[PDB]
Ligand binder design. Structure first.
Ligand SMILES: CC(C)CN(C[C@@H](O)[C@H](Cc1ccccc1)NC(=O)O[C@H]1CCOC1)S(=O)(=O)c1ccc(N)cc1
Ligand SMILES: [Cl-]
Ligand SMILES: [Cl-]
Ligand SMILES: [Cl-]
Ligand code: NA
Lengths: 99, 99
């Protein structure tokens, strides 16, 4: 679709067999989701921005369906205020910002 | 333009006669720029980011150019990792997400 920016660009995602609402975020390097279980290995990471940093778990090679479009990549998991689809997965669904 | 997301969507902005680099950030409700001098009165605002809520200064009706596109709107000033062009100004310039 073409999504305007009058309101937050929220979509439904499917991750880890769960449905979640998430923000399509061109300002986020990497996808970060609220606490949930994911399979496989992980390693700790710190990410930061407005308000400072949080500690997350980095899981690689995770499949997320994003508004009906499947994509695989790294998913960070931790105490994010909002679920965020970042550039690492936006690229895979062919998302662009147009003006 | 059509901006892909393989790298950060950084553009040049012009504010206060000066060129600066800024990030086109669909996950940011608001535009926030690093400390600088802007004209007029300001009002307080709280904004939330990944690490928590912070206080910033809100300036209204500020002239700003974004990638050559003229805008006039609200600019926040405060402790910010990067200059952020958020949805208030992305909407002005006609930016949409597309996939
Ligand atoms: C600040 C940018 C440069 C980076 N962030 C993305 C931003 O879109 C961020 C997303 C968000 C929205 C609402 C609550 C919390 C976070 N919005 C944001 O702070 O909105 C403020 C600034 C003005 O308007 C309000 S991030 O969340 O720190 C981040 C960092 C690393 C990763 N991998 C993922 C996310
Ligand atoms: Cl990735
Ligand atoms: Cl591409
Ligand atoms: Cl505005
Ligand atoms: Na993995």
């Amino acid at each position: 679709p073409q999504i305007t920016l009058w309101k937050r660009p929220l979509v439904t995602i499917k991750i880890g067999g769960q449905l979640k609402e998430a923000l399509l975020d061109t300002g986020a390097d990497d996808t970060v989701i609220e606490e949930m279980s994911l399979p496989g290995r992980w390693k700790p990471k710190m990410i930061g921005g407005i308000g400072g940093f949080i500690k997350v778990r980095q899981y690689d090679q995770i499949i997320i369906e994003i508004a009906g479009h499947k994509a695989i990549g790294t998913v960070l998991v931790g105490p994010t205020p909002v679920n965020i689809i970042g550039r690492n997965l936006l690229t895979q669904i062919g998302a662009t910002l147009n003006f």
